[PDB]
Design a binder for this molecule. Structure first.
Ligand SMILES: NC(=[NH2+])NCCC[C@H](N)C(=O)O
Length: 304
């Protein structure tokens, strides 16, 4: 079993590097963030441009959807996060507290909390309703590259250029696990698997690893791509075959068989680093996006 991802749509409109793309949980929309300071919304199935959401004073590094698909949160170089009502375009809250670039963000499944990571080396947990910072975690000793909640929101995983992945108890703020791998290369991305049992981590030595995070055992290693500089997103694809998907600094999207670790497809089309990929929640659809020399977003579809 290999997939047959093929290019269907190219989405042009951002005027600087794209930073992040994410599908809405309801499957209807794709949200994109950029160094051009904008968020754009696009149809998930047809790539049709929907609207621009503006307000940040500097470039945006990440964007994330609430579980009901009504809200977005964005993370900016302006040291803030913003919560947006997507339909109205309204900025509902500006989350203030970080003392340097906010790099990454996510809602919990309940979507009453937001987690953020920053160049200030901290992770913050925020109340969606009030915009108040509830906890500041002294998480890392270098910039925080990614933050993600597990399936029931009881855990947060964080990654950092300090070379560590840490697991945090959402309720207490306590550090529960530090994952250590030899030579401590910068960790440029991390997230939980959809079931919550594993985490997938990227390091800046051209390597992705699937970890059992309780046992601290590395179960799989994925290689063949290029990643030595940029914080590139990676994914589990679960709508068809069970794949791992990532961008790459050679301008390709890589797809691996999760079990065997073989590369099953490489998607050609982008003309600069593929910084971000996302997998549609119900259909075999991948979105990908590229840095400044390209600036486009691509939608790819497979029969499996
Ligand atoms: N959270 C992320 N991994 N965002 C994408 C990287 C964005 C970053 N500002 C860059 O251009 O390198």
């Amino acid at each position: 079993v290999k997939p047959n991802y093929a290019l269907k749509f190219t989405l042009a409109g951002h005027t600087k590097a794209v930073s992040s793309v994410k599908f809405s949980p309801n499957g209807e929309w794709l949200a994109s963030s950029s160094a051009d300071k904008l968020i754009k919304i696009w149809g998930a199935y047809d790539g049709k441009f929907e609207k621009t959401i503006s307000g940040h004073k500097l470039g945006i590094s990440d964007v994330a959807w609430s579980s009901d698909s009504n809200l977005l949160v964005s993370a900016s170089d302006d040291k803030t996060l913003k919560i947006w009502d997507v339909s109205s375009g309204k900025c509902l809250k500006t989350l203030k507290g970080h003392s340097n670039y906010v790099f990454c963000c996510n809602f919990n499944p309940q979507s009453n909390l937001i987690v953020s990571g920053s160049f200030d080396e901290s992770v913050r947990i925020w109340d969606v309703k009030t915009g108040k910072c509830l906890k500041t975690l002294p998480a890392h000793s270098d910039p925080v590259s990614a933050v993600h909640f597990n399936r029931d929101g009881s855990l947060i995983v964080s990654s950092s250029y300090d070379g560590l992945c840490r697991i945090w108890d959402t309720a207490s703020g306590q550090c529960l696990k530090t994952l250590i791998d030899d030579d401590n290369p910068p960790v440029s991305f991390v997230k939980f698997s959809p079931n919550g049992k594993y985490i997938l981590a990227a390091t800046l030595d051209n390597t992705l690893k699937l970890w059992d995070y309780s046992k601290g055992k590395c179960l799989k290693t994925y290689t063949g791509h290029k990643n030595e500089k940029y914080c590139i997103f990676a994914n589990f694809s679960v709508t068809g075959g069970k794949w791992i998907v990532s961008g790459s600094e050679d301008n390709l999207v890589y797809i691996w068989n999760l079990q065997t670790k073989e590369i099953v497809q490489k998607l050609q089309g982008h003309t600069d680093v593929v910084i971000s990929t996302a997998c549609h929640p119900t259909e075999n659809i991948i979105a990908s996006a590229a840095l400044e020399n390209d600036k486009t977003i691509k939608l790819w579809k497979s029969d499996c």
